[PDB]
Design a protein around this ligand. Structure first.
Ligand code: MG
Ligand code: MG
Ligand code: MG
Ligand code: MG
Ligand code: MG
Ligand code: MG
Ligand code: MG
Ligand code: MG
Ligand code: MG
Ligand code: MG
Ligand code: MG
Ligand code: MG
Ligand code: MG
Ligand code: MG
Ligand code: MG
Ligand code: MG
Ligand code: MG
Ligand code: MG
Ligand code: MG
Ligand code: MG
Ligand code: MG
Ligand code: MG
Ligand code: MG
Ligand code: MG
Ligand code: MG
Ligand code: MG
Ligand code: MG
Ligand code: MG
Ligand code: MG
Ligand code: MG
Lengths: 138, 83, 99, 124, 71, 208
RNA sequence: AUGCGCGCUAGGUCUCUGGGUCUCCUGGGGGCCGAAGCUAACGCGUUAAGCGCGCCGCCUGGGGAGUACGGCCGCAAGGC
RNA sequence: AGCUAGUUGGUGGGGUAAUGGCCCACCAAGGCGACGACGGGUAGCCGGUCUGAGAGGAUGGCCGGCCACAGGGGCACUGAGACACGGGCCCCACUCCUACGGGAGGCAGCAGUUAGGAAUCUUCCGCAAUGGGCGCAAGCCUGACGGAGCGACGCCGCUUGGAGGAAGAAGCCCUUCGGGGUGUAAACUCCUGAACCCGGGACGAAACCCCCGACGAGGGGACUGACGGUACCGGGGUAAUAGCGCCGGCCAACUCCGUGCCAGCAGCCGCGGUAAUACGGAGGGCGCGAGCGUUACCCGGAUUCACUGGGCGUAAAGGGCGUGUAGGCGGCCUGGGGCGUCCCAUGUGAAAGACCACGGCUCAACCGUGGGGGAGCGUGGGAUACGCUCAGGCUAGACG
């Protein structure tokens, strides 16, 4: 079983970040798409789009990188340091308004799936509605 | 039997009283239905005595039979006074 | 408010009576993981119109007997013995694991 | 492990067990001597240390180390335990505590003497 | 204070036991557990069964001694 | 009670000049100038490089010595500060200062802190009406401190007054030098004090 | 001395076995050496011990001791 | 690991203020259970309390609520209400009296004795306050309570002086014999004036009572203190208890003799077998301070049972593998439902405590007033992104 999609996507993204692969692939979903959009808005990727690979709706990820470094380790400074699907299917997390974390004391973001759509932490706070804590990203 | 009465709450030599509504058969500190006012013997403050008038009146209406000190306090506070 | 429950009739082997399985789904007091929990209830029905494998709405009541403390309100769907089936299987399994 | 598994089985909590059956977790316990002896220490260190086997109000018969510099204690004298392991000596979990009862204090301690039932050197 | 009640009596070694513990039969009378001096151990002076060592003795318990001097 | 006993010895130990004698601790006689080392047999021994913890402890001791308070009291004060909002250093220091005895000293109602405390104890002083004898008193801001009329007479007090007819008071306080009065104007800030102490170290020491 | 399942993440090299438009592609196994990464190091490294997720099985100092006691199996040995 | 025979359901009846296997007669043959029954142990439970960054973990002392029990057991009766602590009957156990037939007891009420025990208080005053009961009321009771007494038992507060006063008294210790320390510490001078005595001295207590007013509202009056001659205020008025632990590392603080693997210390590492910074003393020092240590018990540190936050090739640890039930978990699209989930509103979350403010007791403790919050749970409305669920579909998984 492809036992979670979101988690898988996140993993793929992480892998891409690790190996400096500019571009990666992931199957398509509404939820996934929304997440990608959010990421784009934040600035955590360059962009997304849905090309057909094979014959099945896949998804291009356009992978962001920091300026190519000088010194030992001239491998690019990362944009996404760490990305973690927090509400793993099983350990299912639901945060109300008082329980959303200011992740990294504000710098990076959590992503909250909510009644009022799929969105950032700040947005959630503003709208006062909490929900499923899909993923933490910094 | 329901009484408006006094509940001691301060300390040794320092008495302080809750004008309070409860059942007769309870400890003097006991679980009461409604706090309504407070009183101090030392008259130590500008406001040593206070009561919520309306609440007290309501209690009386139902048939809260106040103990005599409590009654006096109520009178002083202006709950028996009718205009 | 009288307690309104919704579960499945998993046994009628009694006069007027139905046994009702309620999946109560709730999060754990620490680990969060939502757990499916079962409580077999006894319910009163001066009809026996409600039969085995029927999903029913259950009302909290004044008691009729030692642990028979519910009235049947109304049917939701009939014949879903498939959900009963699991319960029966579990019961059967009970036999296996003793000595 | 994994979360459902945890829920099923549980984190089998550790009961932190006592280093002392002075019973009841009674902090100090009085006892009567059975034998008073001298004792060879362990393998790193050597001497001949002071231990009484002591029967309790709790019922048992345990080993109790007498500190000081030379006990007044004997064979049927009444004594107090305060517990506490002594590292060198095997099975001894119990300090006899100098001061109370027939465990009289150490003569001519002058420094650490409250641990030893020794009242003040009266000054002039 | 150092209680100097330490009983400085001689004994011929009956037996050998581990850790240099020795049942030594005394000039005084008994044979009691008496273990080696540290000094002796340091100096590698091998106590062997049939030797007149000086078994120091505690008045609290004579039944245990301490070997002081080289045979 | 207090510390009570050899005082400039403490100074020697902590290795910084503190003023506890007042005058005298102003001469070449806080020992410090005449002698500039730790007490006892090994005070004139060559110094060791100490521990971080040790340093912190020393700092704490110094602070405690300055206000000459029981350590339990100090602890309690610290706890209170922690409980309260804001800079748990500066605010703590302010709170400490708001101790009646210290306030008395700092207004220059007394030459020495211990002396001030003694005076307070013996009913010589009065805050805002009542004769207070309790040095611990947390003087709330905007409050008037005077010598008691019954103890207005004594020469010592006069001398003290004369001594501060010559110096400036701490900017969180004012004083009527003539009619033996004074104000605790606002809450004392830490920067208004120039204290031998580094507050952070103190906080660290407490923080376990 | 590596639970099973699925997904992803540089290669090269030999090897077996299949299909191809058959000097080289593409699958499925068996090895070796190694990117990133991981790891206490050794090492591991598209056959992961990496990144994840699903689920289960265990672990919480050694010795005591796989012993005792109980329980079940076994004709016993003994096992769990 | 199976349990259950009034045990599970039913008709009728009894019983109860009332439902009910509470009980009975009879029929039915269930009911519970690994989502942990039954059995064994443990245990009053909670508000809380301690801890803890938090999540938790431990605990349930006093104060508040409820429960249960009054030597053990059983039962009813009276009654609004008990299965009835200072009511009854019965048995058992025990103590007491006996003219041996039999009766009387119940401190897990205060207080105290005794026993056990490491350990825990006065055979106290008083009905003045508060409450309780009775009574028209006066009043009468009230070991509820108010207080005092004992215990550094805990917390908080203060006193054992302050100022001056040697390039530095002696005493004691070290010494490199120059000196250094104790140490401005002292002595001494100045001032204060804890203690202690004299003078006054209470708030707490205005009601209930009387009378005017209708015995109402309202008005006037008077009686009424255990604490206590205490708190306190005025005057006078003496320099007037310091102790304990430590001093190798953790860990703050070092030297000398004594001792020489001995005596000893220890919480761990360990120190000691001849100048021990670790043992015994001395000085010196450090920590606290009317306390300080020790021991127990608990949390922490211990992310060492790990949800936040561990692991499993070799360290403890992958089951010998397969198949497979329960259970857990589930690809993509489209919609409906809205259980989970989220939000708002509101109800509830008692007081005390915790929290913030201010106030009072000379501060603080302590206590008061005000406010907020508070997880959870109900109810009404909604949201539908996700999980669930019902419907339709799809082929990347899976199977063929
Ligand atoms: Mg001798
Ligand atoms: Mg398997
Ligand atoms: Mg590398
Ligand atoms: Mg390799
Ligand atoms: Mg590993
Ligand atoms: Mg075997
Ligand atoms: Mg066996
Ligand atoms: Mg009936
Ligand atoms: Mg039992
Ligand atoms: Mg019990
Ligand atoms: Mg209670
Ligand atoms: Mg009884
Ligand atoms: Mg009894
Ligand atoms: Mg009746
Ligand atoms: Mg009664
Ligand atoms: Mg006794
Ligand atoms: Mg009397
Ligand atoms: Mg009469
Ligand atoms: Mg009487
Ligand atoms: Mg009392
Ligand atoms: Mg104190
Ligand atoms: Mg010692
Ligand atoms: Mg030590
Ligand atoms: Mg020493
Ligand atoms: Mg974990
Ligand atoms: Mg680990
Ligand atoms: Mg192994
Ligand atoms: Mg299944
Ligand atoms: Mg799904
Ligand atoms: Mg509250």
């Amino acid at each position: 079983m492809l036992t979670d999609p979101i988690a898988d996507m996140l993993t793929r993204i992480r892998n891409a970040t690790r190996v400096y692969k500019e571009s990666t692939d992931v199957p398509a979903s509404r939820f996934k798409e929304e997440i990608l959009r959010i990421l784009a808005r934040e600035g955590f990727i360059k962009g997304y789009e849905r090309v057909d690979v094979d014959g099945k709706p896949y998804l291009r990820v356009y992978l962001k990188y920091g300026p190519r470094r000088q010194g030992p380790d001239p491998r690019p400074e990362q944009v996404i340091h760490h990305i973690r699907r927090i509400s793993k299917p099983g350990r299912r997390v639901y945060v109300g308004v008082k329980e959303i974390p200011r992740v990294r004391r504000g710098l990076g973001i959590a992503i909250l799936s909510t009644s009022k759509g799929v969105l950032t932490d700040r947005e959630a706070r503003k709208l006062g509605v909490g929900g499923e804590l899909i993923c933490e990203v910094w | 039997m329901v009484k408006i009465r006094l509940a001691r709450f301060g300390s040794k030599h320092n008495p302080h009283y809750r004008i309070v509504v409860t059942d007769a058969r309870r400890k003097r500190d006991g679980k009461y239905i409604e706090k309504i006012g407070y009183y101090d013997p030392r008259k130590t403050t500008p406001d040593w005595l206070k009561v919520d008038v309306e609440r007290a009146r309501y209690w009386l209406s139902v048939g809260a039979q106040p103990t005599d000190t409590a009654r006096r306090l109520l009178r002083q506070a202006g709950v028996f006074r009718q205009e | 408010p009288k307690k309104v429950l919704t579960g499945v009739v998993v046994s009628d082997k009694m006069q007027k009576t139905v046994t009702v399985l309620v999946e109560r789904q709730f999060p754990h007091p620490l680990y969060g993981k939502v757990i499916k929990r079962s409580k077999k209830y006894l319910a009163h029905d001066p009809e026996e119109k409600y039969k085995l494998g029927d999903v029913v709405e259950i009302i909290e009541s004044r008691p009729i007997s030692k642990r028979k403390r519910f009235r049947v309100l109304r049917l939701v769907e009939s014949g879903r013995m498939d959900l009963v089936e699991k319960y029966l299987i579990r019961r059967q399994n009970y036999e296996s694991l003793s000595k | 492990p994994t979360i459902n598994q945890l829920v099923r089985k549980g984190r089998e909590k550790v009961r932190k067990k006592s280093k002392v059956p002075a019973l009841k977790g009674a902090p100090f316990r009085r006892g009567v001597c059975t034998v008073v002896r001298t004792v060879t220490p362990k393998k790193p260190n050597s001497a001949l240390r002071k231990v009484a086997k002591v029967r309790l109000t709790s019922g048992y018969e345990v080993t109790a180390y007498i500190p000081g510099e030379g006990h007044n204690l004997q064979e049927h004298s009444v004594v107090l335990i305060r517990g506490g392991r002594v590292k060198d000596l095997p099975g001894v979990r119990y300090h006899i505590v100098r001061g109370v009862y027939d465990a009289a204090g150490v003569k001519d301690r002058k420094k650490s003497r409250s641990k030893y039932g020794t009242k003040k050197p009266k000054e002039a | 204070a150092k209680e100097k009640d330490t009983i400085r009596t001689e004994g011929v070694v009956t037996e050998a036991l581990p850790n240099a513990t020795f049942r030594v039969k005394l000039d005084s009378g008994p044979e009691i557990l008496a273990y080696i001096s540290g000094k002796m151990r340091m100096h590698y002076i091998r106590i062997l069964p049939g030797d007149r060592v000086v078994v120091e003795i505690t008045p609290y318990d004579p039944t245990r001694g301490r070997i002081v001097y080289r045979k | 009670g207090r510390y009570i006993g050899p005082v400039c010895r403490l100074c020697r130990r902590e290795g910084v000049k503190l003023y506890l004698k007042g005058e005298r601790c102003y001469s070449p006689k806080c020992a410090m100038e005449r002698r500039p080392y730790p007490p006892g047999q090994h005070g004139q021994k060559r110094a060791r490089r100490p521990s971080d913890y040790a340093v912190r402890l020393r700092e704490k001791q110094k602070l405690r010595r300055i206000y000459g308070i029981s350590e339990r009291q100090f602890r309690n004060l610290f706890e209170e500060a922690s409980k309260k909002k804001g800079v748990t250093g500066s605010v703590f220091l302010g709170l400490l200062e708001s101790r009646l005895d210290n306030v008395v000293y700092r207004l220059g109602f007394a030459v020495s802190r211990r002396q001030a405390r003694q005076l307070v104890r013996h009913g010589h002083i009065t805050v805002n009406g009542r004769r207070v004898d309790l040095p611990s008193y947390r003087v709330r801001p905007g409050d008037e401190i005077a010598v008691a009329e019954k103890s207005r007479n004594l020469e010592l007090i006069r001398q003290n007054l004369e001594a501060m007819k010559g110096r400036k008071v701490g900017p969180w306080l004012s004083l009527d030098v003539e009619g033996m009065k004074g104000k605790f104007l606002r809450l004392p800030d830490r920067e208004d004090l120039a204290l031998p102490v580094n507050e952070q170290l103190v906080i660290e020491f407490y923080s376990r």
